Assembly symmetry: D2
Homo-oligomer: 288 residues x 4
């Protein structure tokens, strides 16, 4: 099992010098660094090539996460937004190929975070979404990318909140390059059973995000890690496990994640490094 961490653990915006973090997590011992997709459309082929060679240099595999904007909403009733959305993913997926990135994940069937003042049309958005995603999936297959649909709690998305819903959606899309993606922070709120949710995901599970109930690094909270290790083994899980902890207030990140107190408790970068590393040793130990 490959273990990684989301660069955002150290940053407050959906961009950063990914080369800096590639070097950092290589030395902390991770196998993967997960980066936000939004700055990638602004990269020249020269920039793409050196990010790839840097990852290759430090032996880090790169995975991508993305919280779509309203403009990239594949489920939109607006046909122009859906058209712009597909063009965005078509370009993005092609860049992922140039980067030898074989996985992208997040609320890709919608946008994040949802603006709840709009009016929800779950039934309508769901049907439009399944159609849009199946299309994008052809481009994903061509670029060799696993398009992972993350199940989110109710406050962040209304389309897919439980693993069963995720499996329903993915089965309805019916394209091998579309997988279900689970996240322990999200399962903690919505699921009746954690091992149960993983087992329900089964062969469709393409990616796993980890964090404690309140998003601290994995291990000293209430998430049932041993139960998760068991269920992953039950489904013969063959994917990466990326920790996505958020412990700092401020910026677009603190605001979108809703960190309203200093959960890191004054950690400086070295302290943050120490804990991610301890949480990595924990995860390899307990989850495999």
């Amino acid at each position: 099992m490959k273990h990684g961490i989301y660069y955002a653990y150290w940053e407050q915006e959906w961009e950063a010098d990914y080369k800096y973090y590639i070097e950092k997590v290589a030395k902390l011992g991770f196998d993967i660094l997960e980066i936000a997709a939004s700055p990638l459309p602004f990269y020249s082929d020269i920039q793409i090539n050196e990010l790839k060679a840097c990852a290759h240099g430090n032996g880090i595999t790169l995975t991508v996460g993305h919280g779509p904007s309203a403009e990239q909403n594949l489920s939109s009733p607006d046909p122009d937004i859906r058209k712009n959305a597909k063009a965005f993913y078509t370009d993005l997926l092609k860049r992922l190929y140039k980067l030898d990135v074989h996985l992208i994940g997040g609320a890709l069937y919608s946008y994040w975070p949802i603006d709840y003042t709009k009016t929800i049309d779950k039934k309508g958005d769901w049907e439009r979404s399944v159609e849009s995603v199946r299309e994008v999936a052809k481009v994903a297959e061509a670029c060799g990318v696993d398009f992972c649909l993350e199940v989110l709690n109710r406050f962040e998305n209304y389309l897919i909140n439980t693993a069963q819903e995720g499996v329903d959606f993915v089965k309805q899309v019916d394209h091998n390059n579309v997988k279900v993606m689970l996240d322990t922070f999200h399962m903690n709120i919505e699921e009746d059973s954690i091992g149960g949710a993983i087992r329900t995901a089964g062969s469709y599970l393409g990616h796993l995000h980890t964090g404690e109930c309140n998003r601290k690094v994995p291990g000293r909270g209430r998430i049932p890690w041993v139960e998760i290790g068991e269920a992953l083994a039950d489904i013969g899980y063959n994917g990466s496990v990326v920790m996505e902890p958020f412990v700092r207030m401020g910026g677009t990140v603190g605001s979108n994640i809703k960190v309203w107190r200093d959960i890191s408790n004054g950690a400086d970068e070295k302290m943050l490094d120490r804990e991610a590393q301890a949480a990595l040793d924990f995860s390899r130990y307990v989850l495999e």
Copy 2:
């Protein structure tokens, strides 16, 4: 220990025929019926004695919960809003005295749900709210009412997300009729420890809400009920326990609570009644 249930488990709006529910709930065996404060301001004085008479007749104690509107926001920087807020609560509290209810709870130091598209000024809102709630406390005291401030998850409020924050706020208010309030659904997201959160609240805990991780009735979910029961015993809790399950889509209730799937799985009124009653026997049994 007194056990209750929030009338909203059967309804999709913040008001209903409370007399009907007093009768149902007395028949299911509950000690308490919790009702939404929303309609109480507009109750003729006859309606108040009728509701009050019904409760006494059926041996049911009434408690009140309230998600305040933006105009009732005691933390608002706008002085006219704070003035209205205070007028709202003084009138509501006098009515509660007439209705013979001694407890009100919710995000009373703020408003609910939070419109996150407005800028967040936590420190400023915090200082204002503490000062505002302290004034209201005087009236709550005159009316024989415990003013309980509920600790909520990050997605529903930004001022108080943990038992420690709630205690810091209440001690700062420094008035005997202002209490901390916890909710198992909210604790499940924010806390490092459930039992620890309860022990942190300690003497300040004046009310407790229950529900599974995903708001189903207590019992077959992942909430650590025994640990909650053991911590209530540790602190010597002398209050009540009200389950607040939300399993139905639709209306203001379904959208404020964000129920996007039929969690009840088709239950009709009779089936909701039985599940409520089974969770009551579980609750009395496990929480002691």
Copy 3:
């Protein structure tokens, strides 16, 4: 879905008692089953058996039997005479169960209990002899309409079968339809890496289930992962019954064999014991099904 019972010994300190009294009590508390100790059964005259049967039937109660065998009834003994005496004991007992209209017996039927550890242990050898003996006793049980359940116990009470995997291995070797694995939350709590895992491991072989908290209090207020147990029973499609086996009182052969060295009941009188068992029944039906 499942039938729920309680072992009569929750109220008694010897491995026998007036079972009719307990059938009447548990029927009123709402149980489907009363599990009784086998020990006094070889001394029941035919009419005593019929009265016990009529009492259970008249009260809509189903009887199951538990048995901690004596060293003289050790089917795994290296002594050929003890094994012979053992088989005769079981044959006679199974026929009595047939007269009683009882279809399930469980416990350390492949050994004896409590095990005297001052004796040298020969696991490999005892295992082989046991498997052999069980096979032939199983044939008698089959003819009597009785499922022979082998209970997986913790290390301090037996050395042959301490985990669900060992229980499944042993039961597969026996290779007889009416011979089954039986799990008990108190024993799994000690030996198993995973509770749900153990149950899923037992799978289609699981024929009986005993319940009790970690220190043997009635189910519900302790640390046993009940919810997890319910999911795993649903995963394996468990059809059988679930019998809580609380032991909260000091004294007698029961207190001594179960090693209750403090008053875990906290001074409960009979009526108090009755109330807890009933709440624990309500809890078990609510949490364990679906």
Copy 4:
């Protein structure tokens, strides 16, 4: 918080070349090695200093565990047995002071493992033990050693099975050098609450043994480690935490601990080293803070 491990994790008898293990565990990263008291009386005065030399050298602190024989039973109704028991502990404890060991633990108030074949007189054994222990306590306060009374499950002892009984006995002894000692293996069986038991022990908690429900090294089993760490923080535990894993069949250890299946799953000494090391990282991570 110092972390250790019991040497018997690698051995099948209650003795071994403790130097080999001090060097092993120092390399593995442990702060402490716990050794069995059994072979200690047979040590000559020279043998003591060597062992103590080998320990300070490697920067390892030594704690001692001891499951008493019937003849060292401080709770015995036989005055001659109680007499020899105090003699045994007085001698053993003087040796411990010459080793600069400051803590000993186990069913020191009785014997282990007990023969349940005999007649048990809990009330009587309890009263004799309380007095005997309080006496031995004087000698312990003298050799600068903490006399730790470990709470055991019903199958291994009948005098003290819960933290509450442990605290009651210790408070009865009423002596600064006698502490309560908990063990996750035993608490897992007897306690209503793990964190509750630790909080009950409170300031009386003098030592802690860890292990999974079935005695594997800490980490991948069902023990509530986080709850344990939060509870140690609640009581401000300063003490040592010693893992006591037992995964091997055979010998007196295999028989006393009752390992009747190869729980190690064919691990060799190198494999056992790795798991203990990983469990150590887990324990320092989860248990602290």
